[PDB]
Structure 1
Amino acid sequence: FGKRKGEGFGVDKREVEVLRRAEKLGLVTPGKTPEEQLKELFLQGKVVLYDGRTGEPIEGPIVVGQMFIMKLYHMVEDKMHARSTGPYSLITQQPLG
């Protein structure tokens, strides 16, 4: 928010609006300025987020952050097996691949 201050702009209708629902919630000390309220709200680990599809905010602060996440190895089974017809065992006549 410091850069936001200098870059030239303040707070949204949206940012204020989610604050309203946030104090009614109990995340921000009623009576303090939005600038101060947002700090409180940030320290809690959550910030305001807008939808992306509608541009409106998501009522209520939502946490966000840098979480490490790994990708897991795909086993041979992962190669989804689909079989129509095929071989058959010699003594047992049931399907075999």
Structure 2
Amino acid sequence: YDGRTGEPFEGPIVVGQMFIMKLYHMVEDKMHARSTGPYSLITQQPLG
């Protein structure tokens, strides 16, 4: 059925238990943005 509506689905949908996993990479870490930070001593470029 549809928990949003309550009407069922035209076709059937497979389900059941499956083994899955949360991989290392998490946006909680990777995601970043800066405005004005430090720069490479040589040329005034930013830092990766």
TM-score class, shorter-chain normalisation, is 0.7 to 0.9
CA–CA distance in 2 between the matches of 1:75 and 1:63? 29
Higher fraction of helix: 1
CA distance 1:77–1:92, change in 2 (3 Å): farther
CA RMSD after TM alignment: 2.5
TM-score (norm 1): 0.42
Deviations 1:39-64 (CA, angstroms, capped at 9, x unpaired): xxxxxxxxxxx011111110111111
CA–CA distance in 1 between the matches of 2:2 and 2:27? 39
Would you say how many aligned residue pairs link Structure 1 and Structure 2? 48
Higher fraction of strand: 1
Bigger relative CO (Cα 8 Å, ≥ 6 apart): 1
**Identity percentage of aligned residues:** 98
Matched position secondary structure for 2:45: coil
Instruction: Report how far residue 75 of structure 1 moved.
Output: 6.1
Unaligned runs of 5+ residues in structure 1 are 1-49
CA–CA distance in 1 between the matches of 2:8 and 2:26? 41
Instruction: Report how far residue 88 of structure 1 moved.
Output: 1.3
Deviations 1:74-96 (CA, angstroms, capped at 9, x unpaired): 36994312110011122212123
TM-score (norm 2): 0.73
Consecutive aligned runs of 4 or more in structure 1 exceeding 3 Å deviation? 75-78
